[PDB]
Symmetry: C3
Subunit: 319 residues, 3 copies
């Protein structure tokens, strides 16, 4: 249905000439939102994003193509499926970057209820996807509890200490904080902050965190399914906090938390929690070899919860 093509320029690129993952997340979300709004005919905001995995890391000079489609509309929400291809403009070769799902919610104005049409079903796949959407919705809705329950099976005893020869390090020097002011290009015409914009900012903070652990070149491997818990509008300040949670050989998990404050809330210290997300990075050296991250040694009560958290999340993924 909706198709976006973007040539990767220096402006979208990192130090290493690779597409910023955050930039890609923003583009995915924009395409998805437009697919939702083509179905709904009103403005739509990002409700949640499913697990997204990146199969390639696109480079300056290549062209990204993003296709998004409404697979099913429920009451106020719809599931959007997204496919991202990359094409090399010298060899003409195309590769799959990512296949993903995002959920959008229609935001009518202002006291009118919205009536979402039935999505048109033509091919076999259209009908299969329409069923699968109800299943995928169940996973979305049970996700918080699934994790919360796995956490009950983890130790909760903070006595874990690695040997001196293990070479474990603390995560303390990998914490990162940043802040962004939400401006009119960051929000739709009703002033609601784009979810893609939040994701792009998230990822940029998170990558710095990964960098402070390996001192190499991180690239994003995946982001876990997460929910936008509440609205953000123009004028908000979004405060980002990220830290490494755990390592698993060639993977590191960085968690990031996003809090919103309007000008008043900002002075009064009381913000809203917009979302939290968990990003897995790999990293390469200058000879392009995969880096093995050190073992992590949790110290604080928070350190430990996040060490177990990354584990619970990893096991939920592998399944």
């Amino acid at each position: 249905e909706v198709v976006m093509s973007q040539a990767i320029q220096p402006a979208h690129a990192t130090a290493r000439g690779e597409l910023s993952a955050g930039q890609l997340l923003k583009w995915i979300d924009t395409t998805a939102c437009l697919a939702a709004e083509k179905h709904a005919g009103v403005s739509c905001v990002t409700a949640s994003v499913d697990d997204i995995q990146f199969e390639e890391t696109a480079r300056v000079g290549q062209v990204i193509t993003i296709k998004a489609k409404v697979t099913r509309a429920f009451s106020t929400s719809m599931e959007i499926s997204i496919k991202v291809m990359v094409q090399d403009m010298l060899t003409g070769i195309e590769k799959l970057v990512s296949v993903a799902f995002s959920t959008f919610v229609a935001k009518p104005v202002g006291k009118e209820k919205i009536h979402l049409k039935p999505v048109t079903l033509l091919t076999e796949q259209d009908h299969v996807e329409h069923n699968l959407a109800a299943e995928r919705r169940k996973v979305r809705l049970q996700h918080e509890d699934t994790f919360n329950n796995l956490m009950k099976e983890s130790s909760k005893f903070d006595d874990l200490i690695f040997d001196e020869e293990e070479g474990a390090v603390s995560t303390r020097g990998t914490s990162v904080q940043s802040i962004e002011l939400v401006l009119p290009p960051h929000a739709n015409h009703h002033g609601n902050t784009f979810g893609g914009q939040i994701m792009a900012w998230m990822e940029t903070v998170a990558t710095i965190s990964a960098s402070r652990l390996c001192w190499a070149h991180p690239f994003l491997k995946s982001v876990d399914m997460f929910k936008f818990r509440g609205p953000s509008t123009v004028g908000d300040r979004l405060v980002f906090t990220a830290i490494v949670n755990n390592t698993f050989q060639t993977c590191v998990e960085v968690g990031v938390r996003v809090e919103a404050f309007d000008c008043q809330e900002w002075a009064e210290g009381r913000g809203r929690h917009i979302n939290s997300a968990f990003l897995i990075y790999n990293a390469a050296d200058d000879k392009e070899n995969l880096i093995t991250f050190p073992r992590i040694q949790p110290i604080s009560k928070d350190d430990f919860r996040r060490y177990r958290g990354a584990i619970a999340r990893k096991r939920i993924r592998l399944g």
Copy 2:
């Protein structure tokens, strides 16, 4: 009158360290608009752009200088002349990039008619340009019909087939589609989409199309005179469609079509045609040699119309 200077940074650059043509079009249009508004004292939108040819391709590290002036004001419209120079900041050498004309229309608010002053005429050239503007206006106004009539002299018989040894290729794999959401930085303070912004987006889609034919490094040589057919505002989605129309040795023509939809129109499938444009590209290889494009083999009814179209347009240019 109005002067803009821009140092070319990585942010404005392509993969090859060259100024994005689309970025240059946006800058030209901004300077021109400011010249129009300095004369009109109200907000002004891009009505049309004349043929624009690029004599050099500027590079990261050089400085662009753009001078625009109102040459003549009519009733609601005025002709703006633009000159673009590039300076190399290591050798100090300046070169002409482009000499161009654009027409702007005053958009008063909201029920008041606008009274355009007579442009001040001082030098010989001021008086010559004032006359030439009336002529150039005639060419602008007769342009659609001039083309439409040349098309009557072309074959209209779709039987054209190149030999197998000719090595002609179809244009099918060079089509490109993209989409842009119009946000507040993309429009003036009355919400009207900048024409320069549309041009920048146009060119970025078009260059991808040229790339899919040669698998090299395109650079823009010219854009044909074209008209903005109707307004666009914040909240519109602009859908771009581009394809190669024809080749002429070292030149390829890419056409691009721009349709606007507000949120309602977007869901109801009924958009407005904003403009269509036709861009000529050259391309270089990695040893910096001009590429010769393959011969084009039209297949569909559309293929043929655009094959003839590029010819009609080329002949109108050469004259």
Copy 3:
């Protein structure tokens, strides 16, 4: 209090892979503004900036960290102190970039007076800084007169001529003019232009001016304390004029003037003077050696005033 972290990407970089000084000024100002607004709970605009000196020039691939804090609140204004660190992401090494002060003014809406709380004082330094703020405020307020008085001691006789073998050059070919349209991302949600945005634009014009003198690679060394003389809003055009004022061996002073016009004022030729600033640059050659600038030969009445001006400013700095 307020912490911003930014990884330096190609998008923020110059031709030479170095962070744009203007980009850094924008980031400093944003962080500072957020510190002011965290204290005031209303929107705050940049009133003035103190002397700022840059100790390092950060590069693509490094991470900037900016910490800003309210040191003292007066009646409507507050002093903000800022510290900028840079971290190399390969060696993990951190270096001080800059320590600075900026003054913000609360802009309540619209007929309500603002009541600024007393800043909380905890550490020794908190109490020292609170006193020092009253002193630093005195320097801010006496700055225009201090300069004006030094100028009385300078020659005012325009007879200064350097020998032919001195190799002095005129500044005439280093003047630069540019223009920027103020758009919604350039202003807070009340439409007031960000001071940081003006600074970023200032610096980009000024660096071109330095470039036209040495034909090398300028990097910003410092900006003098200056005042924003009046408000700017969305829709303004900001006209920048810059020229080299004087040279002092490895330093060159570039002055820049900023005038604002709304659409009406723009057509009627009557603008507002927003600020003027004076920036000192060094420059390196391609083998990374410091460039020695030529001696400057003033010619016009303006040339001479600015030659003396740069001197007065230099002496005020050294003290």
